[PDB]
Amino acid sequence: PTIAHGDGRRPSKQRTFIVVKNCHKHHISTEMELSMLDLEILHSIPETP
Amino acid sequence: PTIAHGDGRRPSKQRTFIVVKNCHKHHISTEMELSMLDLEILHSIPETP
């Protein structure tokens, strides 16, 4: 908006500002290790304690 | 008003003051701009959505 003033200065027309805001994408990585012998007995079901 | 005194000083009379004040004027002006196309098609009826 504007103000009207009695002063001799020119009045200024209606004005709008159009503003663009942009994203930021961030990337996150973690790592895990698993033993082969550990993965071995998982499939079978145990019989002896 | 005044207050009487016993002294030999000459008396000041009844005192009257008349003060005149007048208006002051202010003018206020805004300017707006309207495009041709808006004001034209306002009269036009909607044929299609």
Curated annotation (Swiss-Prot), chains A, B:
Protein name: Major capsid protein
Subunit record text: Homomultimer. Makes the hexons and eleven out of twelve pentons. Interacts with triplex proteins 1/TRX1 and 2/TRX2; adjacent capsomers are linked together in groups of three by triplexes, heterotrimeric complexes composed of one molecule of TRX1 and two molecules of TRX2. Interacts with scaffold protein; this interaction allows efficient MCP transport to the host nucleus. Interacts with capsid vertex component 2/CVC2. Interacts with the small capsomere-interacting protein/SCP.
Protein's job: Self-assembles to form an icosahedral capsid with a T=16 symmetry, about 200 nm in diameter, and consisting of 150 hexons and 12 pentons (total of 162 capsomers). Hexons form the edges and faces of the capsid and are each composed of six MCP molecules. In contrast, one penton is found at each of the 12 vertices. Eleven of the pentons are MCP pentamers, while the last vertex is occupied by the portal complex.
Subcellular location: Virion; Host nucleus
Domain of life: Viruses
Similarity section: Belongs to the herpesviridae major capsid protein family.
Organism: Epstein-Barr virus (strain B95-8)
